[PDB]
Structures are given as structure tokens and as C-alpha cells.
Amino acid sequence: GSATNASKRQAIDASVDATLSRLYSTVRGSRELVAKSRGVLVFPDVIQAGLIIGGQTGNGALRVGGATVGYYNTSSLSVGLQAGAQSKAIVFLFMTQDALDKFRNSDGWAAGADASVALVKMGANGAIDTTTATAPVEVIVLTNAGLMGDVSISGTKVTKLKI
């Protein structure tokens, strides 16, 4: 069990919903910014301190218009983010159709390399300010300490999973 295309899909897709729900309940304003996005990719990187879950934990799903249109995996993650016995969640928001299509048609997307990316910080009210948005790709990083504005995602490369 849990070794087929459908089971892998189930694990990823359900974890995305669960992870995304935690984001909305933890961080105010996130939902509105996501609505401003054409598509949202969530990375529920769940790791254990020694035990490797499956093999690749950097698995995520692209949710477009409420429906998952494809699944993605990070072949190479930035070490500064990977270091630590903590599970991380990374959300990529594409506010432009050009960026959504370019990402979808790509077979190797690198952060900062192909698209310009902004690390979104919550406003002074403690909520993500949608008016502060400007980049075509907006990056929200959810850590066990909440949003971290001191994160560099350079070096992160995502590939498309054929499931």
C-alpha cells in the first residue's frame, strides 16, 4: 500500500489542503493574497529527525481555480532552509497568468533564476498586506515560528511530477 500513483497523489494533495488551512488560521491576510493569485503551490515538507518519509519530502501540488492541475517536487532545495529537525511549508503564489503558464510548461523552474520572487512579510498589523504585493511571484514561507522574512529561497529548483 501507499506505493502507487494514486496513493502518492492522495498523500500530497491532502497534505496541501491541511498545510494551507494551517496557514490561513495562523496568518491573517494570506487567504486574500491567494485569491489574488491565479495558482498556488504549497510545499508541505514534513521531515523527521532521522526517519525519511518516503524519500522525497519536498512534494507539493499546484492548486488552480480550486482544482489541482499538477504536482511538483523540489529536486534541489536551499540548504539554509533544509538544515534543522523542523518541518517547513513554502507557498508560491503566481499573480499573473504568464507566470502560471510559464511555470506549468517548465520542466525545471528555479527560484530567482527564471522568475523574480518576493518574500512576503506580514504588515505592521500582523496581517499580510495585499496592497504591498508587487512581484509576479510572491513567496510566503511558513515555519514553526510563523512567517520568516529572513529566508533566501535562491537555489530552490522544482520539477514536475508525472502523476
Side-chain angles (χ1 to χ4, degrees), residues 77-134:
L77 180 61
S78 45
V79 187
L81 283 62
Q82 183 65 329
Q86 293 289 30
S87 302
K88 303 81 70 188
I90 306 180
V91 182
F92 296 104
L93 299 181
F94 308 110
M95 76 167 185
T96 46
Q97 193 54 85
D98 291 90
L100 205 295
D101 274 276
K102 189 61 178 297
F103 183 87
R104 181 177 57 141
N105 296 333
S106 72
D107 57 285
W109 182 86
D114 299 273
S116 185
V117 290
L119 191 68
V120 182
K121 180 184 182 59
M122 70 179 65
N125 66 332
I128 299 184
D129 184 272
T130 44
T131 312
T132 309
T134 303

Side-chain angles (χ1 to χ4, degrees), residues 21-57:
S21 301
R22 284 183 294 129
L23 176 66
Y24 297 158
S25 45
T26 301
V27 185
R28 287 173 296 135
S30 315
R31 188 194 65 187
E32 300 307 285
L33 195 70
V34 173
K36 166 182 169 292
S37 306
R38 312 298 182 199
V40 49
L41 172 66
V42 183
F43 271 101
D45 177 80
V46 292
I47 53 173
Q48 300 181 91
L51 296 176
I52 308 179
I53 303 179
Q56 297 75 31
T57 55

Side-chain angles (χ1 to χ4, degrees), residues 141-162:
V141 290
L142 181 70
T143 64
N144 297 270
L147 297 189
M148 185 61 59
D150 301 279
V151 175
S152 304
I153 56 169
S154 187
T156 303
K157 177 184 176 182
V158 186
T159 47
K160 183 187 293 85
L161 299 172
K162 297 178 294 178

